[PDB]
């Protein structure tokens, strides 16, 4: 394989640098690479991909109900709903 002097010297260097000091195939070095990196699900890009749409939507709805945010889209939708109610189209009762 390798000269024993070089092998022992490389082992000493690995021990000094904290690397694996015993022979190990790549299949078991997968454990080292798994524990060295963060899990994919734990990365901030993964678990915090979407913004908190609940927070944004509820905050804007609360501001609109408090009168400090004029949601023009919601005003248009409410006007359309009122016109539809006048026309006679309305949601049927649930579980009737």
């Amino acid at each position: 394989s390798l000269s024993e002097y070089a092998f022992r010297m490389s082992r000493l260097s690995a021990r000094l640098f904290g690397e694996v000091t015993r022979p190990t195939n790549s299949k078991s070095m997968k454990v080292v690479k798994l524990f060295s990196e963060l899990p994919l699900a734990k990365k901030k890009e993964t678990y915090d991909w979407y913004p908190n749409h609940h927070t944004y939507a509820e905050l804007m709805q609360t501001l609109r109900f408090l009168g400090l945010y004029r949601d023009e889209h919601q005003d248009f939708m409410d006007e359309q709903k009122r016109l539809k109610k006048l026309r006679g189209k309305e949601k049927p009762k649930k579980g009737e």
Binding site: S3, E4, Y5, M9, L12, L16, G18
Partner: protein, 196 residues
Amino acid sequence: PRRKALPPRTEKMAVDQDWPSVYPVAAPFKPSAVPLPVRMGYPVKKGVPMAKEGNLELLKIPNFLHLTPVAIKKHCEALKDFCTEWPAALDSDEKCEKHFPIEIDSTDYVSSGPSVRNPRARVVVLRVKLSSLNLDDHAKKKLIKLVGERYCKTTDVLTIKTDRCPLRRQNYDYAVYLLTVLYHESWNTEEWEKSK
């Protein structure tokens, strides 16, 4: 009657005024504050660039009106108190290497956003000329062989890059410890070292 907008205060400004007082800190361009008749925007055919009033293009610019040369000079005159004189005994890099053989490199990153965290700032680099260390032939050879690619034979410089620890101080301490243990192990002799 409806409210009347006052004339801009640039009219009241004097030619020999102290401009840095007008803009002490960084602030967006304000037409009512800037007395310069600056114009921006691509002119229309047979036209002129749009005036400063309502000029969104001027508002977009990260202006340096708060950093005029007079303001820069005054700021540096104020800040000269905080500085400390560089040692004149090592005006050249040769004296720097003679007295300070170990150089530590650490990068600080500044970026916009509410979070100042940046992992890339945890890296520490330790560079030392092995000729500046107390080593003999055997110790130098053993240390070079142990460090491997971390040592460049051309420059005779050992470079240890530490980023294993989360923090800057932890990585710096790790680099110092690595250099110390490498030196001490290099001076150490082992049984397997004989069979070369």
